[PDB]
Structure 1
Amino acid sequence: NANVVVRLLIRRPEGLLAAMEEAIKIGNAIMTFYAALIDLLGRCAEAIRIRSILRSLGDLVGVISIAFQFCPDHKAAMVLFLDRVYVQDFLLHLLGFLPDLRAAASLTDMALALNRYLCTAVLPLLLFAGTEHHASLIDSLLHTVKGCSLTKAQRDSIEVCLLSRPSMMQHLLRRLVFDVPLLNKMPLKLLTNHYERCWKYYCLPGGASEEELHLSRKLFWGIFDALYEQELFKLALPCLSAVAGALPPNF
């Protein structure tokens, strides 16, 4: 179906990208109109010669423009277009998630857009700037510390820890152990309990790093005496115990 529709668009498409960027100032309907146009174009994926035409009609200008400018649907349609049509360095070059993670406590249209951008952040899951993105993700997660969408946010953070080096992982794990003193909330506790596996994968490669490791071991020993789901967090805290054994091998 989309084949024949795109061929009809190659019969009649009807500087549109420049005119996209103007009518924000005053009219909303033409903006949502081009958003629906590019979203419909995003719903298709031999036919590789028209997969070129998917890639053909410059688009990254509009992507980066709507990556930081209402705000839910246009950017969501652009992400749907970009992920289907169009490595990790250019993937993180778009920092679009920076103002979204920055405005993570802005409560209301964006307060409805927050659960949209939770699952929208699941879409790019497939060196300093990596530390910056880990900081923004930890800021949004502590803002999240919607709940069923927060499960998708937690899966997004799990794949974010699965994305990798270990230096920015330790830089974010410092804040994770800092927030673990505030909880060990329970979602941040389970997030740090899952991040204990990535810290174990970093410390097995590695064997104030050992100083923060001993501080985390003492805080985990205190959380073991501070007391199902808490039992699950304690059983995944044994991954942090193995990390400490491989080491010894809102503000």
Structure 2
Amino acid sequence: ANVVVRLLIRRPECFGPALRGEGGNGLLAAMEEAIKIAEDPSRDGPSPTSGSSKTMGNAIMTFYAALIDLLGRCAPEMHLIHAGKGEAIRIRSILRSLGDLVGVISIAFQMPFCPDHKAAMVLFLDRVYGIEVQDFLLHLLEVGFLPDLRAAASLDTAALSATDMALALNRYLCTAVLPLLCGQLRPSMMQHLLRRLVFDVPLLNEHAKMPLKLLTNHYERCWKYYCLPGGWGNFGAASEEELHLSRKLFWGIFDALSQKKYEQELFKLALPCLSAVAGALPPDYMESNYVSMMEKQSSFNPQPVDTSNITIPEKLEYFINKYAEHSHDKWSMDKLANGWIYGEIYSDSSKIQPLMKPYKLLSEKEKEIYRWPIKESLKTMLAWGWRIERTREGDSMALYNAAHGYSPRAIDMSNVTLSRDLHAMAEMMAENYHNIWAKKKKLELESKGGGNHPLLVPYDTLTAKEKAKDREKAQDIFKFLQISGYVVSR
């Protein structure tokens, strides 16, 4: 390795196609120029578009993948014999200098392309850089975001849906054990891993995924598992007699020695402990499914409901109109930031909006647009059935500090804390909204007759990018449901 590194860096004629300067091997330009030529079009640059699962085409981005694979495999051995004390530090310094090469994470981020090249990409980081520090793992937090999302969708015994590249994906995830050897915001990769064992497509490959879920909780905080334990307990109670024998292993690993200095609650552990007790006796005998189960205590929904024949009582007469006007005021503030002004004749070029007027004079189209989601939401939890309060002192509709007297003002209502029961109700409403989105996705998929989308997935599947929008919508729900003296609870 030392000799080949010395000779290759003495004679770097492996030039790059786009970037200038002596040498080359600039992935940040070569990979990006090669994908636009290879993915949609054919092997040549000027060429028509054809080819599905096609694994100047397959040449350059495999030649590179081989090059960084060779560099990673010839990187000096780490943390077994040599740890910065064997004169081999100059080789690692040269490899890091070839920062530009630190952008291997950025290179792997461009997920649309053979899945096997990502194995070399992560192997380079394992060899020359290492993720032993928590900062890089906090930066990434996933082996691959879109690959993890896509492996969830590609799980079925179908011809055109899976069993085409999912095997290569499974091999790449088998390689992907970098997190092995204190979650800050929300690491939820074990929920993604839960889908893998539901239907074991690759035989014997679940052994590589067992420690990814096992050792994760040891590093993870007990409280960081919030409602994913509830979902997993639901699935475990459903499949208490199943080939998924890692459920009891996770049960033991959590319940035993999950009691830290905090000594967290066991009331939520009582809900599935009785289910496990009542489901362990009707089965007659398994040889190892009940051995370690000695101490279990310290001491997908596409259609939520149907509201075709639900009548809304007319207890909403004033606050609904007030909050519709508040939403219109927020829209007016947004269009004022855009540059729109009130006028008489609508004109897109001149940025004239004649709708800058009170809700009583507003148009029926925008009135229905503002009223339909709120009315549908109210109908939904009225259909579910919960109590409604009318507290007198909760009247915070108008308490914070142009033509027709239209003077909207910004209100900072995001500083208010809400209760856990109201949070659960808003989470149910958010699940209903996600199911509505899933319904529109199913309708458009049926209309198109073919396609796939990785957003037909539960809460924990969502990464931070979409979770930001989800939290913004949840905050809007909190703002709507925290005022007007109306309280909903069980």
TM-score by length of 2: 0.27
Q: Is the 8 A contact 1:190 1:233 kept in 2?
A: no
* Residues 62 and 104 of structure 1, relative CA distance in 2, 3 Å threshold: farther
Gap regions ≥5 residues in structure 2: 14-25, 38-56, 75-85, 154-160, 232-237, 284-490
2:122 alignment partner in structure 1: 79
Q: Is the 8 A contact 1:203 1:243 kept in 2?
A: no
* Residues 68 and 116 of structure 1, relative CA distance in 2, 3 Å threshold: farther
Deviations 1:103-125 (Å, cap 9, x if unpaired)?
3336255312222232232123x
Deviations 1:18-65 (Å, cap 9, x if unpaired)?
223211122221110011000000012901111111222145564233
* Residues 25 and 187 of structure 1, relative CA distance in 2, 3 Å threshold: same
Q: Is the 8 A contact 1:55 1:85 kept in 2?
A: yes
Q: Is the 8 A contact 2:115 2:168 kept in 1?
A: yes
Output the CA distance in 1 between the equivalents of 2:202 and 2:163: 31
Deviations 1:215-237 (Å, cap 9, x if unpaired)?
99999999999999999999999
Deviation at 1:210? 22
Output the CA distance in 1 between the equivalents of 2:167 and 2:60: 22
Residues 58-137 of structure 1: pairs in structure 2 closer than 5 A? 58-59=99-100, 62-69=103-110, 70-86=113-129, 87-94=133-140, 96-105=144-153, 107=162, 110-124=165-179
Structure 1 range deviating more: 18-27 or 235-244: 235-244
Number of corresponding residues: 213
Tell me which of 250, 258, 263 is aligned to 1:220.
250
Structure 1 range deviating more: 29-38 or 115-124: 115-124
Deviations 1:58-89 (Å, cap 9, x if unpaired)?
45564233323324122111111110000223
Q: Is the 8 A contact 1:180 1:188 kept in 2?
A: no
Structure 1 range deviating more: 103-112 or 210-219: 210-219
Q: Is the 8 A contact 1:66 1:75 kept in 2?
A: no
Q: Is the 8 A contact 1:204 1:243 kept in 2?
A: no
Q: Secondary structure at the match of 1:179?
A: coil
* Residues 240 and 217 of structure 1, relative CA distance in 2, 3 Å threshold: farther
* Residues 212 and 181 of structure 1, relative CA distance in 2, 3 Å threshold: farther
Q: Is the 8 A contact 1:38 1:78 kept in 2?
A: yes
Output the CA distance in 2 between the equivalents of 1:229 and 1:116: 40
Deviations 1:133-154 (Å, cap 9, x if unpaired)?
xxxxxxxxxxxxxxxxxxxxxx
Q: Is the 8 A contact 2:183 2:224 kept in 1?
A: no
Bigger CA radius of gyration: 2
Q: Is the 8 A contact 1:193 1:236 kept in 2?
A: no
Q: Is the 8 A contact 2:72 2:128 kept in 1?
A: yes
Output the CA distance in 1 between the equivalents of 2:27 and 2:188: 44
* Residues 210 and 84 of structure 1, relative CA distance in 2, 3 Å threshold: same
Deviations 1:180-222 (Å, cap 9, x if unpaired)?
9999999999999999997999999999999999999999999
Q: Secondary structure at the match of 2:152?
A: coil
Deviation at 1:163? 11
* Residues 35 and 99 of structure 1, relative CA distance in 2, 3 Å threshold: same
Output the CA distance in 1 between the equivalents of 2:218 and 2:125: 30
**Higher-RCO chain (CA-CA 8 Å, sequence separation at least 6):** 1
Q: Is the 8 A contact 2:152 2:196 kept in 1?
A: no
Output the CA distance in 2 between the equivalents of 1:56 and 1:242: 56
More helix by share: 1
* Residues 168 and 245 of structure 1, relative CA distance in 2, 3 Å threshold: farther
Q: Is the 8 A contact 1:54 1:85 kept in 2?
A: yes
* Residues 221 and 40 of structure 1, relative CA distance in 2, 3 Å threshold: closer
Gap regions ≥5 residues in structure 1: 125-159
After TM superposition, where is structure 1 displaced by more than 6 Å over at least 4 residues in a row?
160-249
Output the CA distance in 2 between the equivalents of 1:217 and 1:111: 24
| Structure 1 position 244 matched with structure 2 position 265 | no
* Residues 9 and 74 of structure 1, relative CA distance in 2, 3 Å threshold: same
| Structure 1 position 233 matched with structure 2 position 259 | no
Structure 1 range deviating more: 33-42 or 98-107: 98-107
Q: Is the 8 A contact 1:196 1:236 kept in 2?
A: no
Identity of aligned residues (%): 97
Output the CA distance in 1 between the equivalents of 2:138 and 2:11: 35
Output the CA distance in 1 between the equivalents of 2:126 and 2:251: 44
* Residues 50 and 101 of structure 1, relative CA distance in 2, 3 Å threshold: same
* Residues 104 and 163 of structure 1, relative CA distance in 2, 3 Å threshold: same
Deviation at 1:4? 0.5
Deviation at 1:94? 2.6
Output the CA distance in 2 between the equivalents of 1:189 and 1:57: 35
Q: Secondary structure at the match of 1:231?
A: coil
Structure 1 range deviating more: 210-219 or 168-177: 210-219
* Residues 13 and 241 of structure 1, relative CA distance in 2, 3 Å threshold: farther
TM-score by length of 1: 0.48
Q: Is the 8 A contact 2:191 2:228 kept in 1?
A: no
Deviation at 1:241? 12
* Residues 98 and 170 of structure 1, relative CA distance in 2, 3 Å threshold: closer
